[PDB]
Amino acid sequence: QALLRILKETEFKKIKVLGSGAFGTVYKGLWIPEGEKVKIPVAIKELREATSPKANKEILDEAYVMASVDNPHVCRLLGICLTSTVQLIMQLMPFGCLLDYVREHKDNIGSQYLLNWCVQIAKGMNYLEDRRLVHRDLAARNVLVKTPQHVKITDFGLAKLLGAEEKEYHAEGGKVPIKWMALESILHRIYTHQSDVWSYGVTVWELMTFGSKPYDGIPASEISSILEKGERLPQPPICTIDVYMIMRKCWMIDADSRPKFRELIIEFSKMARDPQRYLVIQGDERMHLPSPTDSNFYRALMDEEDMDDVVDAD
Amino acid sequence: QALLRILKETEFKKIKVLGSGAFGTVYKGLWIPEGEKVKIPVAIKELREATSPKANKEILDEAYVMASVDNPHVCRLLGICLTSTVQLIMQLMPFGCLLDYVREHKDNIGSQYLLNWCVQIAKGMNYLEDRRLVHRDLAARNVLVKTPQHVKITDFGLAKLLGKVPIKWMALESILHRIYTHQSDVWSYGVTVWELMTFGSKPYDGIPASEISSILEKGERLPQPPICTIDVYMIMRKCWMIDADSRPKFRELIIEFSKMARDPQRYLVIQGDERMHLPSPTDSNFYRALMDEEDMDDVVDAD
Numbered sequence: 340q341a342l343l344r345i346l347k348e349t350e351f352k353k354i355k356v357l358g359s360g361a362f363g364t365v366y367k368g369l370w371i372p373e374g375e376k377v378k379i380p381v382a383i384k385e386l387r388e389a390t391s392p393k394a395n396k397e398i399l400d401e402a403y404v405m406a407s408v409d410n411p412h413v414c415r416l417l418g419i420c421l422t423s424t425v426q427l428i429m430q431l432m433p434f435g436c437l438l439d440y441v442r443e444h445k446d447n448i449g450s451q452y453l454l455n456w457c458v459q460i461a462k463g464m465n466y467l468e469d470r471r472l473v474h475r476d477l478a479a480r481n482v483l484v485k486t487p488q489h490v491k492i493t494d495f496g497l498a499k500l501l502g503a504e505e506k507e508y509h510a511e512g513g514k515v516p517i518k519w520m521a522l523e524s525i526l527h528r529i530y531t532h533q534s535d536v537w538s539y540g541v542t543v544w545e546l547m548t549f550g551s552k553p554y555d556g557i558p559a560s561e562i563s564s565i566l567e568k569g570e571r572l573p574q575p576p577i578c579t580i581d582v583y584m585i586m587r588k589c590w591m592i593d594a595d596s597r598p599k600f601r602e603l604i605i606e607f608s609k610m611a612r613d614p615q616r617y618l619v620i621q622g623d624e625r626m627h628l629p630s631p632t633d634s635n636f637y638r639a640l641m642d643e644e645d646m647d648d649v650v651d652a653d
Numbered sequence: 654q655a656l657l658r659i660l661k662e663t664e665f666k667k668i669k670v671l672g673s674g675a676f677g678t679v680y681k682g683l684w685i686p687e688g689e690k691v692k693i694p695v696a697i698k699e700l701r702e703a704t705s706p707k708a709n710k711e712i713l714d715e716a717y718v719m720a721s722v723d724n725p726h727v728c729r730l731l732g733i734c735l736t737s738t739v740q741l742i743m744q745l746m747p748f749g750c751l752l753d754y755v756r757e758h759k760d761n762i763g764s765q766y767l768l769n770w771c772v773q774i775a776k777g778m779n780y781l782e783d784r785r786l787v788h789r790d791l792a793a794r795n796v797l798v799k800t801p802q803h804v805k806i807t808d809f810g811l812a813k814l815l816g817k818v819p820i821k822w823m824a825l826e827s828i829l830h831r832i833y834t835h836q837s838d839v840w841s842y843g844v845t846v847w848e849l850m851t852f853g854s855k856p857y858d859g860i861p862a863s864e865i866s867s868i869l870e871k872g873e874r875l876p877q878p879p880i881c882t883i884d885v886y887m888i889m890r891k892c893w894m895i896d897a898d899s900r901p902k903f904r905e906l907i908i909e910f911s912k913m914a915r916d917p918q919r920y921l922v923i924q925g926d927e928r929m930h931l932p933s934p935t936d937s938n939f940y941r942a943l944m945d946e947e948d949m950d951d952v953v954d955a956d
């Protein structure tokens with residue numbers, strides 16, 4: 340399986356730490372091809388230890404699946420280093436993750452960017468469902484910005500790889516994303532494509548609120564209770580009722596009543612052709628998608644892979 | 654049209670000098686998109702102050718042409734900054750130019766890399782000929798290494814834009830009459846191949862440029878490289894025929910070097926060649942996904 344490069348400790352080095360999450364620590368790194376004089380920037384995540392003593396062969400098998408994804412909106416695992424720690428290597432995304440991007444660019448994001456991001460996340464998740472892969476940790480922090488016009492899903496399958504100890508599902512601010520999880524996942528560890536759809540709804544809510552924390556101030560131990568009582572995330576100020584109803588449909592108790600990712604692609608694509616009808620943002624008229632000139636420059640410089648055209652307004 | 658972005662001085666910064674040529678100084682630069690927090694590496698060439706400056710409308714017209722090339726083996730001009738100086742911006746090639754690459758790798762380059770580089774250069778030049786574009790300064794220094802498996806021609810059209818003269822790469826008719834054609838580009842292709850097969854030797858070492866037209870008229874040519882079978886050397890000699898129309902075509906050079914690339918050790922005799930193969934599919938997939946995602950024809954591999 341030539342899609343996963345087995346790297347030795349000697350051919351790459353971790354430099355600047357970029358962040359930390361439930362799954363490990365992310366570094367900006369340099370790959371030094373053997374026999375060459377160049378240093379190639381990469382992203383390295385040094386994983387925390389799985390909650391099970393699984394063979395390196397099982398770790399490699401699951402890494403091969405992560406290296407097999409071929410879709411413009413899913414990040415492909417490129418390499419792995421199995422020494423004392425498991426280190427994953429992929430292409431460096433210099434714009435960061437979408438959660439931090441929307442927080443940092445709050446007052447300058449228009450409806451066309453927001454709706455296209457929802458389309459692209461749904462396209463990537465639809466591909467994962469087609470591959471019979473459940474993400475288990477879809478969130479705005481796990482959507483990466485290759486360019487502001489091109490986002491890609493990362494960290495799929497890591498939850499099942501590393502697992503989580505049972506106490507973390509009852510702790511505060513722990514490793515378990517309780518506030519993104521479907522009720523059936525909280526209560527019974529049930530993870531399906533339809534529970535991914537629930538997390539997609541929370542992810543869209545993150546984007547439409549420009550990075551607000553869902554259920555902020557509500558203890559994680561009481562999330563399952565308030566969900567059972569019918570409480571849900573509030574309507575973001577910029578969202579029309581059409582957009583808010585889609586999010587609410589993603590959080591229905593009956594998993595089979597939730598939308599499908601293929602349906603979400605179509606609906607958000609429709610709204611992207613009339614963006615100001617579905618999101619109300621002030622000064623939206625000067626927050627257009629890039630001109631063809633800037634798009635050509637963007638692509639040739641740092642994003643040469645094939646991708647569907649962004650959905651523009653009619 | 655929309656293929657050439659006009660940049661402001663404030664949105665990019667030169668950080669490192671990478672090299673210099675007859676036309677100007679090359680910098681590693683950082684592009685800083687307005688409103689963003691990222692710094693994107695780019696290559697910047699600041700052109701030197703010409704003695705017969707061109708009009709700004711003329712400069713932009715040629716920059717649009719340079720920005721219109723769409724081929725995996727020709728570098729596309731991406732941006733320009735037109736102030737007191739002309740600055741050209743394109744994607745940064747971190748492996749450098751092919752001339753310095755083959756010199757630094759003098760002792761580890763295998764026959765399969767050398768022959769494929771000849772294939773790829775011929776593919777890029779054939780595209781330029783398809784576009785009715787004459788390069789005028791093809792040389793190993795003007796071939797850039799995006800990956801060791803993927804080289805691209807740069808600096809086409811700069812010679813005409815700026816009106817220092819690479820006599821030892823030029824066809825005789827270009828030396829005598831300043832005639833530049835696709836067939837004179839073929840002559841420079843022959844010298845470029847000689848550079849690669851000698852691992853970056855200087856052509857006509859010890860002969861002053863003022864004497865080159867004289868020795869060419871006497872029938873003297875660059876010698877057979879030690880690693881080249883006569884099959885490869887005969888192609889080079891055909892590129893240096895006095896009659897431009899008897900020289901090979903770039904389309905023909907693609908086919909011949911591709912043919913040799915399928916049995917590389919038959920056509921280049923290199924010491925230790927039984928070690929330096931092309932990357933495995935694993936290593937090639939890793940290279941492309943990391944830094945070379947553009948569409949390209951696959952390498953010609955030995956069968």
Ligand SMILES: *CCC(=O)Nc1ccc(OC)c(Nc2cc(-c3[nH]c(CCCO)nc3-c3ccc(F)cc3)ccn2)c1
Pocket residue numbers: 357358359360361365382383384416426427428429430431432433434435436437438439480481483493494
């Ligand atoms: C908000 C989370 C984040 O990743 N921020 C961020 C700041 C600066 C960056 O470069 C200047 C990047 N680039 C990047 C990140 C990742 C990545 N992000 C995560 C989530 C962390 C917390 O949610 N995980 C990864 C990752 C890294 C390496 C792998 F092999 C697999 C997954 C990937 C690529 N580029 C991001």
Ligand SMILES: *CCC(=O)Nc1ccc(OC)c(Nc2cc(-c3[nH]c(CCCO)nc3-c3ccc(F)cc3)ccn2)c1
Pocket residue numbers: 671672673674675679681696697698730740741742743744745746747748749750751752753793794795797807808
């Ligand atoms: C052989 C000369 C050379 O360019 N060496 C080299 C050393 C280090 C590098 O990056 C670490 C690069 N990258 C690169 C170079 C160029 C480029 N090279 C030339 C010719 C120099 C002598 O002929 N001209 C350019 C150039 C730059 C910007 C433009 F708009 C047009 C042409 C381009 C991209 N990356 C090279």
Ligand SMILES: [Cl-]
Pocket residue numbers: 359360361362363364
């Ligand atoms: Cl993480």
Ligand SMILES: [Cl-]
Pocket residue numbers: 673674675676677678
């Ligand atoms: Cl130059």
